[PDB]
């Protein structure tokens, strides 16, 4: 299970983007060049890599 923590709040711009608040923890599922695909607030969707750091233990 790979997790990301939000550095900035993010608001979906398309039907398949996530929404999240600063400091929220998001499940990371996949990626493309500049974007993560993941899950938060019971939705799966895209968000840019610039909005998060990855976290561990």
């Amino acid at each position: 299970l790979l997790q990301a923590q939000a550095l900035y709040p993010w608001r979906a711009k398309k039907d398949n983007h996530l929404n999240f608040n600063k400091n929220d923890v998001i499940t990371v599922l996949e990626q493309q060049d500049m974007w993560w695909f993941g899950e938060v607030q019971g939705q799966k969707g895209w968000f840019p890599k610039s909005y998060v750091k990855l976290i561990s233990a």
């Binding site: 398309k14 039907d15 398949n16 599922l29 493309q32 695909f37 799966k44 969707g45 895209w46």
Partner: peptide
């Protein structure tokens, strides 16, 4: 989810 439209269609 790997064959879902939300995923396959990408972020743009």
């Amino acid at each position: 989810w790997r064959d879902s439209s939300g995923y396959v269609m990408g972020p743009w």
